[PDB]
RNA sequence: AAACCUGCAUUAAAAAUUUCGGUUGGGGCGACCUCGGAGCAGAACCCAACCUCCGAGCAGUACAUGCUAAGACUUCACCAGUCAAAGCGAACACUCAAUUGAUCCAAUAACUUGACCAACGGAACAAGUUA
RNA sequence: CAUCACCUCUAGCAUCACCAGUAUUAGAGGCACCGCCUGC
RNA sequence: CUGGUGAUAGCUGGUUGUCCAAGAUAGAAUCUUAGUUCAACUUUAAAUUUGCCCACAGAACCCUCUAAAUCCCCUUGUAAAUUU
């Protein structure tokens, strides 16, 4: 039951404060996704800030 | 009180006889400088893992030696199979090497007498054992 | 359940029902879904959509919760700008 | 003031966002391109071992 | 002084009525022991010359382990009561005159 | 709990292996109880040239490349396109955890360097079809794919749980384009069926039969072969080794080579099983095989491995304090 | 100076309260408890416990894996679980038999997260023995 | 079971037990005389 | 011995006039199988309109083939069924 993946939180760069949790490989650099932000109603860049838990 | 805790630890925690306590202090004066926790761990290591009883510990000057060298020589002998931990009854399959052979003898001569291993092999074990001990402290 | 209190001699209310359920005056009980805040990262959006919604209890559960609460919780309230105000009465209901 | 401060911060971030997306999109291609270029280099190096034999 | 507080809330009794204490209301928790608070200085008016101050009628502050043990029993100092200050104020006034 | 499986495994080994190795057993026992050295197998699909430079900075040395140049010095060759980096003799340094590269695949794999010898002894050639029995979890399977000399592969292991671990290893390391086609076939079936499903199909067959793994048994407390429930399996374990090897021998075409590998020091499961399969084929199917001499193979890898020179047929790599690779036993037999 | 006393901590001693989860004629040694599939009820559904056998406690691809909303299915209750037109917004209901855990509580600005609670509808924390 | 005998362990001392005692003593224990043999 | 104490007992035993009426065997969960909760079944009251029986038609290929049947079900015979 080795923890290959970890749970990280992506914070929107639009300043709206909207954030969502996604699963990524532990042995990988910080993700920068292009996710939909409901506050501005468009796809915005997101940045990993803090690891939540190890899956 | 520093002296009081040292002797009381031997008498109460280590269950040493008052006659035996005087001999240890007379023979091994490094006990007072040694920390109580490290001293207690050193004693129980010989009593349980090694199987050495109270009278032999006092006579063999066990407590004066460094704890680290005891771990290196004993575990290497234990893994070599030359040393057998006494069972519940206290019997051993093979007579264990005498404590004087393990500790009083020099490292180079100790390997030839009992370990029957080359110098180079023992050096690698110490680095391996140190890593295991270092991980042991961090893990606990 | 305390059917007769030791100081007033009257029926008591179980506070574990008040903190979890909402009673519409029509008789319905509204509750949450068990697990709408637990392990949302492993649940599909369709599953989470039906978890963060309010549902109604059945006949047996509603009867059970009525016995565990006093008449103070079954009275008609007139809270100002209550989100559930329009749900307190049934419309076009037969039998 | 708190509502206006949050609104201004959103507008300021949204101003730089189109350029950030383009730069982020460009960085994705550049890393993919460089990895693709290395694959060509390795194929030549792998071929060189067979090239020496022949 | 041991200052303690009740773990469990005591229900209101009302006006003119005694509170009803329960077996669980006997459970206390230590809030503060006044013996472990920083010490204070006792304010005294000296009557005779001392090593710290040699002027009679000069208000001084020293540790309570000194005024209570030495200054007060021996009559070296008196309490800094407002009435004593008024009496010594007149004494100082006569000295100036 | 109760009786530790570690002590039961050690007791069984202590009685059996003291006679076999004599004075060498105390030296072997310390290495077995100590952590084995990990070799770094560079992924050829990834940035192999860059990782090779990176490992050399960590004082790692490619013993495989050194062994390549020793073939002409001493005077079937071996499987080419293998790069495994290990430390110097007596060095306890551990490699850093593997990382994905720019290609999206892990740069290298950490494995026992003694497990590469069965792949090396296989003498793999380009354009061949390779059958691996008990391929999971993929210690030897990955090495075969690294060579690139196998156009078609059949990775079969009885336990689906081990197979699932193999596929994840293949996905992370081997690019999907190779795995997309029928080149790599992964199944979970008894290996004894392979002697009838596909006869004479493969030119190179690698048979790593299940066995009491000395390194894992003395440390792992989960699913130990020496626990009371697994005693029945341990008793019938030599029987399985004879049947699984025989199935692999029948699977190869005449003129092909089959390498039998076992991770144990037990003679009853290393030499006796090899002799049993040879007799079994002649008696029941009238099949004759020739065991090749691995002494030439041993003399090249003596620098980085310790070898036991009292083996009837195969080659046994014994663990040591300075060289902790092992225990590994492999025998190369060809079909005539 | 020192002691006694008191308060608060730290070891030790001697005690205090409480309990022995189920399944397999008994004991020993082991296995088992949840979920999926088959022998397994030949044809709607359900149903053969014990038993025999093999699995699962993942991973991968997405980052609109967004938001809302008719009508239904449902592991024979409940809890839970499943499918879904239209619509807004975008583009031009992911794969996978199982791949999972309620409430309370804890952490957090919010979002959200936390148990081999595997005795798997889960007691916040308790063994042996009695001839 | 107790038992002389043997053995282990603890204790350097007083005004209510031990004790109006003081290590040839007192207490807590094992074993069961003696004799022979043995560890150290 | 007294008091708390009419301790508690999923366990054993007992449970007192007459007459009539309706009325028995799917399960799930559980420190659970000597118990309880829900469902099913049963009872009473009420409301409403269909209920049962059932003509065709219809309900999968597999591993090659193969049973008594079952589901659904207009007519028709009947008087029940659903809901509160
Ligand atoms: C000792 S491991 C060897 C693993 C692999 N060969 C390696 O070295 O990297 C043997 C594996 O063979 C598998 N196995 C056991 N019995 C088998 C059988 N009858 N047929 C095929 N595989 C079997 C087991 O699951 C076990 O994990
Ligand atoms: Mg009042
Ligand atoms: Mg249902
Ligand atoms: Mg339970
Ligand atoms: Mg249960
Ligand atoms: Mg269930
Ligand atoms: Mg008796
Ligand atoms: Mg006796
Ligand atoms: Mg009673
Ligand atoms: Mg019961
Ligand atoms: Mg009747």
mmCIF file of C-alpha atoms in Angstrom, chain E residues 31-83:
data_model
loop_
_atom_site.group_PDB
_atom_site.id
_atom_site.type_symbol
_atom_site.label_atom_id
_atom_site.label_comp_id
_atom_site.label_asym_id
_atom_site.label_seq_id
_atom_site.Cartn_x
_atom_site.Cartn_y
_atom_site.Cartn_z
ATOM 1 C CA UNK E 31 -7.115 28.616 37.228
ATOM 2 C CA UNK E 32 -4.252 30.321 39.062
ATOM 3 C CA UNK E 33 -2.240 29.926 42.261
ATOM 4 C CA UNK E 34 -1.461 33.378 43.646
ATOM 5 C CA UNK E 35 1.774 32.109 45.224
ATOM 6 C CA UNK E 36 3.396 31.858 41.767
ATOM 7 C CA UNK E 37 2.635 35.432 40.708
ATOM 8 C CA UNK E 38 5.397 38.056 40.526
ATOM 9 C CA UNK E 39 6.039 39.796 43.824
ATOM 10 C CA UNK E 40 5.101 43.386 44.633
ATOM 11 C CA UNK E 41 6.835 46.136 46.592
ATOM 12 C CA UNK E 42 5.389 47.425 49.852
ATOM 13 C CA UNK E 43 5.158 51.207 50.151
ATOM 14 C CA UNK E 44 6.367 52.493 53.524
ATOM 15 C CA UNK E 45 7.317 55.785 55.169
ATOM 16 C CA UNK E 46 10.645 55.492 56.972
ATOM 17 C CA UNK E 47 10.995 56.730 60.550
ATOM 18 C CA UNK E 48 14.713 56.048 61.113
ATOM 19 C CA UNK E 49 17.709 55.998 58.797
ATOM 20 C CA UNK E 50 18.286 52.749 56.889
ATOM 21 C CA UNK E 51 20.957 51.620 54.441
ATOM 22 C CA UNK E 52 18.640 52.027 51.445
ATOM 23 C CA UNK E 53 17.346 55.455 52.529
ATOM 24 C CA UNK E 54 18.504 57.490 55.518
ATOM 25 C CA UNK E 55 15.804 60.200 55.499
ATOM 26 C CA UNK E 56 12.820 60.063 57.837
ATOM 27 C CA UNK E 57 9.517 60.639 56.069
ATOM 28 C CA UNK E 58 10.817 59.565 52.644
ATOM 29 C CA UNK E 59 8.450 57.110 50.969
ATOM 30 C CA UNK E 60 10.254 53.932 49.895
ATOM 31 C CA UNK E 61 9.279 50.641 48.264
ATOM 32 C CA UNK E 62 10.987 47.359 49.179
ATOM 33 C CA UNK E 63 10.237 43.650 49.018
ATOM 34 C CA UNK E 64 7.501 42.411 51.343
ATOM 35 C CA UNK E 65 10.050 39.997 52.857
ATOM 36 C CA UNK E 66 11.887 43.037 54.272
ATOM 37 C CA UNK E 67 9.192 45.482 55.385
ATOM 38 C CA UNK E 68 7.113 42.808 57.118
ATOM 39 C CA UNK E 69 10.134 41.172 58.764
ATOM 40 C CA UNK E 70 12.477 44.053 59.588
ATOM 41 C CA UNK E 71 11.116 47.542 58.914
ATOM 42 C CA UNK E 72 7.697 47.142 60.536
ATOM 43 C CA UNK E 73 8.389 44.995 63.655
ATOM 44 C CA UNK E 74 11.409 47.131 64.593
ATOM 45 C CA UNK E 75 9.536 50.412 64.101
ATOM 46 C CA UNK E 76 11.935 51.518 61.378
ATOM 47 C CA UNK E 77 9.031 52.238 59.010
ATOM 48 C CA UNK E 78 5.284 52.842 59.127
ATOM 49 C CA UNK E 79 2.522 51.982 56.685
ATOM 50 C CA UNK E 80 1.973 54.453 53.844
ATOM 51 C CA UNK E 81 -1.537 55.279 54.982
ATOM 52 C CA UNK E 82 -3.016 58.520 53.594
ATOM 53 C CA UNK E 83 -3.408 59.832 57.148
#
